[PDB]
Every structure is written in structure tokens, then in C-alpha cells.
């Protein structure tokens, strides 16, 4: 008897804007209890601090630039010089996803919201691994229905902002898009209650644009602008969250489910007000307010409850860690994932990952156990050492030539064994990612 | 009377490999009085250390990243996710040559040898502002005639290495390539001596494969292996251009006829024996051995004979100086190459560059008067004073760490005003062109 696994991925949260990350204003009450259930990681990452290319990741358990998934996907943003724009963007079909793992163990599959892996009919959910879809295609949609009228006068490209149920059906959601996609999670768990099943829960929340329930921001009367509408749909987030947990309670299902909370890449702190405390950074810079995001693995009977694991980790541990404990033999050699089952539990004292990396053109960072590197193209390689220094505001390259130049050298053995990217961003969007990194280059504080 | 223009362009020549330029062992006779006959240029600069990207920035005017053309075109070395493969890789439509802005004045324009700017018929000289033609589309080809049994089997790149007249008219070379290619642009200028005419005489030499005359071999008994057939075809390359400037002395042309010898990147010293003396580095790095080349303007009673011009020139300067002396009142605002005829004769006593850039991908430098920043991927950028120590052997960054910090930035304004690129390279050629780079990081010495 195998376990059922539940992914809920969070988009574009603060690393600071839960109860069990250190909250006082946000709560987090369903994902609270979720945390004290299971193990909270102090050090998990994301394989990149942007939406698409995090997703990549996560869904293959590979480093996505190995395949060219280098840049986020945003049709209508690529440079003209770009090899694939538009819809030709998405996973390359040669790549198997978690779903394709899972469904080889006899899973039934299932992804509720955000997508964004390809537009195209042939990157579509269900020809990746996924029974059962409704979500949308694209990167970011309204958390209420959109009106004849809009869908009717919409760019090339807005087709991929509808909510979709499998292959080509579009309905609008008759509610706050969040609720909706928890109370599905929710059917779809009570209707495929006897078999194992795989749930990709892929909230849109907190991603803009900031529309919230008029039920949430009652509650946050003390919270003012943008940080009132993170709040409020933080709530919603936790409340959709709720839904899918009370039910595998309910059912009984809570004993031999594996339930995973994470977050594709670390909070735009300048369009939707969250907050990476104590780290510096935001989405799409690789300071550790970047790739460093909230994750809990919960296994009731399995997993030791309200117990921390302080050793780095990552989203693409996930798919071995998934298909391990679906008693999976047949893995692919290509996997960059360690499962973390041995790690969680004891039986491997060791660090699951000694060197981790990551890239977005001339930016890239190295870590070898507490050492970060990171390399810009506007300014000279800093480093830090993440045991002593989270917020990365002391850096020790001066003091640490040798190490610097080691470390630059394993950075480079590590980009020889990629892919050129299958899709390039505009120019400009470079400039606007390290100008944001700047204004957010001190440590943020609770709160 | 408009002067003629004679553009004589070698292929992977030494820095130090000319007499003019203080070679011990080589014979350049020929090129040796056209140095003294007008101006040689001590810091001349290619815009990129590769064949495609150079020729792209000399044909117009501008900084070849500005326009996509990044790293080098090569039918089946690109990335599977490039862009542009084969044919389809050139030098963008949208792009007005050396050859249109010509033509414009009225010149009868040609080109002999290596275009190298594009293999499809839509990028051939003749739809490039060239009436005449006589060479190859590719980048290399041998210095002998191919058999009818290595034309039929050769894979589907090979078309662009057969010699070519005009518009598709396929004839191998009866006779040393070198020596056809000098002999037919004499044709074309007696051919045309009473018109003015443009002549790009890009000489496959010294490109490999390393393939002489035997009467030439006979000359350098003291040399061995890759240097003696350096030896021989840089002898060939010298009687080839000899060909050219007696035509001209001949016909009593010489007067009124403006001749620039150079050169398209530094010695790749490891295929071809060339030698970069004094310079450290090679072709395909960013180091003076790539990027500074051999460098000559003569202009009979225009230009003061034996005399040397010593602050950083470009050869993006060309299409200017030829469009001006040709008498052109239509100059593109895009242009980023200087009329530098006012600077040789002594009117304008400003450097022509203050600030110079390079960049392909993750490798990218920036001069500044004397100053040269040089972003690696594999180690810390590395800072040089070029006034005082011309072989990059001493890095200054460290203890100039707020000038490395404003040119870093200076570098990153000017890679945000260029295109992403058209196409990419291989991964694994990366490793190769930083390997070379160690393996000549040391001062080359005449040997
Ligand atoms: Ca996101
Ligand atoms: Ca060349």
C-alpha cells in the first residue's frame, strides 16, 4: 500500500510571511498545524528564483538549465532574436515529469492552478503525467472570473489566463480562484479516496494581481495598501490550504499521506508587499531571499512532528523523495534530487546536497556546504558564509581569494554540463531585476 | 576624384608575426613597405576574437552585439536549441555594409576570399553592396582545388567552402588559393582603373588548414612542423598583396588609392603556430593576444610616410574612414566606428576611443584610456594598466576596487543597449577557448 502525496506550492510568498517562519502581522493558522505535524526546513531552495524555471525543477528533479529552461517563459517578453516565443515555450517533451513518475507506480494525477511550463496543446498538463487538470497555462491570472467582454478583447496571448478543466474545457471560477482550487483538491481527493493518488496543488496566490476576498481584508483593518491584499489572500491561501488537509483527516487518508508545503522562488517584495525576513533579496536575484523559500514535509506515523532539518535541501529532491516512497525502482540516472526519506528520519547523518548551484545567464551562484558565491555581471563576485552571515551583508571574497577561485572554477565545470537556453528574456528585464536586488539589499524584518 | 579603397584582411595572423611588427623569423617584404609607405597603428583593435563576429563589426561600423551577432557563426557547432543553424545564420538584412555605403558614392565594389557573413543566397556579397565576387561563403576551405570525389561526398555544410565567382558560378582554383585570390583582385583593378573602386580582399590566409606552396616551404629550412607552413603561407599572403600594390604602382593608382592592412582576430596559436609577441592570449579570448591585430592606413601624399599612431583604434573605424574619404554625406546615427583621418593627420589630437568594449557571453571587457576590465566565467575579473604592462601579467583589481566597481557598471550600461544573441555555440567550446586562454596566459616572445 502506497502513500498518497500532496504538493501545495505557494507563488511568489514571502520567506518571512508565515506564523511558522516567524509572522506577527500574517496568519497562518491551517499551514501552522501543518508545520507542527512534520518537519520545517530552515534551508530549502527552489532551483531558481523565477516561476517558470523553479516549476521546470521541481517537476523533473533536474537542474532545468541541463535541458535549456535557463529564463522564465513570459510570452510577449522573449527578445525577437529569441529561438522559441510564445506557445513553443514550455518543458521539452524528452523531459519526464513527476506526474510520468508517478503514474509508472499506478498514482492517479492531478495539478489545480498555475502551470506554466508551455502554452501549446503539447506541453498541456495531461500529456506530462496529469490525469486530471484545472488550472490555467500561463503565469498569472485575476482570482475572480473574467468577463465576456475582456476574454472577447484580449492579446494574443490571454488564452493562457483562462481556467481550464482538462483538454481545452474553459469555465471561469464561480469564486475567489484560491477557494475554488483548495475545494477541487478537495473533491478530487474524496473522489479517488481507495487508490493512490498525486495531487500538484500550484496556488497562483500570492502572485499578483492583489485581489483578495472582501471577507479577508475585514480582517487585517490595521494592514494599509499592498500589504492589506497579501495579507488577505495569505489567509486565503491558508484557508485553501485547510480544505485539502480537514478532508485527508476526514477520510482518514492524514496516516499514509505525504503532505509537502513549499514556494516556486522567494517574495517580489516591490509588487506584492512580502517580506523575505531575515533574508536580503527578492524574486529574481539569487540572494538568499531569491531561492530560499518556506517547506515542510508532514508524513503522519513516519515523519517525527514539530521537528526542524537544518542541512540544505531542494525542490528538485522532490521527485526522487516522491517516487522513493511510491516504491519506485526504475529512476532515471539524469536526477540531480536526493530522496530525503534516509536524511529526514536519521538513518543518513550526512548533508544530502555538500555543492548546489544556480544561473540565469552571467548571474550564478555556487555553494559548497556554507560558502555562497555569487556571481553578477555589474560587480565583482562576492562571498558568504551562510553559517554566520544568513543576510549576506559581509562579504569575504578580499579575505578569501583561494576559495573564491576554486569555487568560481567547480561554478564553471558545473555550467559546461548545460544546455544553451531554449528562449531568451528582452534586454531590459536584466536591468530591472538588479536594480530591484538593490533596494532590497538589506536584511528585511517582521514587523 | 574620389580615392579607391583596397581592404586587404588576413585570417588568424600573429600580433607578432610581420616583419613590420617585429617578427625574427617570418618574411612579409611586401607588407613591410606598405607599413612604411603610410601609418601603422601600435594598439588596433578587432571587435570581437573570433572570424564571424569581426567581420560583422568591420562590414558595419558598429558594435555586432548591437545586432545579435554574438559568438561565432559555424554551420554544425551550434547549439541544437540556437536559434539560427546552417545557412540561416548571418549578418542581419537590416544591416547596411561597407559595400551599400560605397556603392552609394559610386565605387565599383568586390570582394575576394572569406565572406564568412552568411551562407543562403538572401546573405551573399552581391545582395550586400559587392558588384563582384570572387570566394567562399564559409569560414575555411583548403588553399588547393578539391577533387570532383571530395565535393560530391562532403556533408551539407560543405557548398559554402567551393569557390565561387559572382552569384553561383562554382570553379576551383587552378593555383595556391592565396595566390588566385591576390591575381584576381589585380584583374579587377585594372579591369575597373578608371572609375573608383572598394576591394575587400579577405585572404583566407592564414586560416588552417596549414597548406603552402612547395616553393615557399623551400624558403624557411630552419623552421619545423605548424611553424614552417606558418612561415611559407604568410610569404604567399605577402606576395598575394604584392600583387595588389604593384597593380596600383602599375597603372599609376598608388597616388590616389587609400590601402588598410589587417587582420580579423589574434593567432590561434595551438592550430596555426602563430605567436602573439608581445601579447598574451590567442583568438577566441579577450585578452590583447585576441583582440589587438596588425593594423596599417597608407594613403600616398595624404598620409606622412613611416609614421606610428599610438592611442586605441578599432577596425568599426573602416566604414567611417572609407564612407569619408569617398566624399559620404549620409552617415547612419547608429555607427559606432570614428572618421580617423582627422586623428592621423594630427587635426584632432583627442583620443578616437575613450571607452572600448568586447563581449561574448559571460567573457566581456572594458577599457577605459589605459584601464582593461576582464569579466571571466571561471575566475574574479581581473583589472589591467595597458600603459605599463601591455602583457596583462599584473592585476590591479584588488587594489583598485572602486575603479573595478564603476567600469563593472560602465560594462553593464553597455551590454543593456545591445540584442540578445541570433544564435549559439556548443556548450563544450566554452571550455575550449578558456583551456587556450591558460595555456597561453604567459607573454608571448618573438624567437
Ligand atoms: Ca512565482
Ligand atoms: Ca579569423
Not at 485575476?142 to 489566463?161: C, L, P, T, V
Request: a neutral charge; glycine letters at 8%; aromatic letters at 12%.
Amino acid at each position: 500500500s502506497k502513500p498518497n502525496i500532496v504538493l501545495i506550492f505557494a507563488d511568489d510568498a514571502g520567506f518571512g510571511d508565515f506564523g511558522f517562519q516567524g509572522s506577527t502581522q500574517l496568519k497562518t493558522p491551517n499551514l501552522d498545524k501543518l508545520a507542527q505535524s512534520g518537519v520545517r526546513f530552515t534551508q530549502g531552495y527552489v532551483s531558481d528564483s523565477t516561476c517558470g524555471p523553479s516549476r521546470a525543477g521541481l517537476m523533473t528533479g533536474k537542474y532545468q538549465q541541463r535541458f535549456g529552461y535557463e529564463e522564465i517563459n513570459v510570452p510577449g517578453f522573449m527578445s525577437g532574436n529569441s529561438a522559441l516565443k510564445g506557445a513553443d515555450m514550455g518543458l521539452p517533451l524528452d523531459q519526464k515529469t513527476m506526474g510520468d513518475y508517478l503514474k509508472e507506480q499506478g498514482y492517479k494525477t492531478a495539478v489545480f492552478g498555475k502551470w506554466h511550463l508551455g502554452d501549446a496543446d503539447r506541453f498541456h498538463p495531461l500529456k506530462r503525467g496529469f490525469d486530471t487538470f484545472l488550472g490555467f497555462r500561463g503565469g498569472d491570472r485575476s482570482y475572480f472570473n473574467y468577463s465576456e467582454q475582456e476574454m472577447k478583447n484580449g492579446n494574443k496571448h490571454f488564452f493562457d489566463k483562462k481556467l481550464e478543466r482538462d483538454f481545452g474545457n474553459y469555465e471561469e471560477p464561480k469564486e475567489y480562484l484560491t477557494d475554488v482550487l483548495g475545494k477541487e483538491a478537495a473533491k478530487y481527493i474524496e473522489q479517488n479516496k481507495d487508490e493512490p493518488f498525486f495531487i500538484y496543488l500550484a496556488f497562483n496566490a500570492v502572485h499578483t494581481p492583489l485581489e483578495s476576498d472582501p471577507k479577508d481584508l475585514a480582517k487585517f483593518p490595521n494592514l494599509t495598501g499592498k500589504r492589506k491584499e497579501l495579507a488577505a489572500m495569505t489567509l486565503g491561501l491558508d484557508r485553501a490550504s485547510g480544505y485539502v488537509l480537514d478532508k485527508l483527516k476526514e477520510l482518514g487518508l492524514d496516516d499514509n499521506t505525504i503532505v509537502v508545503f513549499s514556494n516556486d522562488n522567494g517574495g517580489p517584495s516591490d509588487k506584492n508587499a512580502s517580506n523575505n525576513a531575515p533574508l536580503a533579496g527578492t524574486k529574481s536575484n539569487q540572494l538568499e531571499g531569491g531561492i530560499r523559500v518556506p517547506f515542510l514535509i508532514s508524513w503522519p506515523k513516519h515523519i517525527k512532528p514539530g521537528s526542524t532539518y537544518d542541512y540544505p535541501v531542494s525542490t528538485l529532491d522532490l521527485l526522487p523523495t516522491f517516487y522513493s516512497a511510491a516504491k519506485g525502482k526504475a529512476l532515471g540516472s539524469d536526477i540531480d534530487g536526493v530522496d530525503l526519506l534516509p536524511y529526514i528520519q536519521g538513518e543518513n547523518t550526512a548533508r544530502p546536497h555538500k555543492v548546489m548551484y544556480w544561473k540565469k545567464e552571467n548571474r550564478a551562484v555556487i555553494r559548497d556546504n556554507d560558502w555562497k558565491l555569487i556571481r553578477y555581471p555589474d560587480r565583482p563576485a562576492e562571498l558568504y558564509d551562510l553559517s554566520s552571515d544568513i543576510s549576506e551583508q559581509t562579504d569575504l571574497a578580499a579575505k578569501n581569494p583561494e576559495r573564491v577561485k576554486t569555487m568560481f572554477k567547480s561554478l564553471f565545470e558545473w555550467e559546461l554540463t548545460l544546455e544553451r537556453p531554449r528562449w531568451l528574456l528582452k534586454r531590459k528585464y536584466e536591468k530591472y531585476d538588479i536594480d530591484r536586488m538593490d533596494k532590497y539589499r538589506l536584511p528585511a524584518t517582521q514587523p
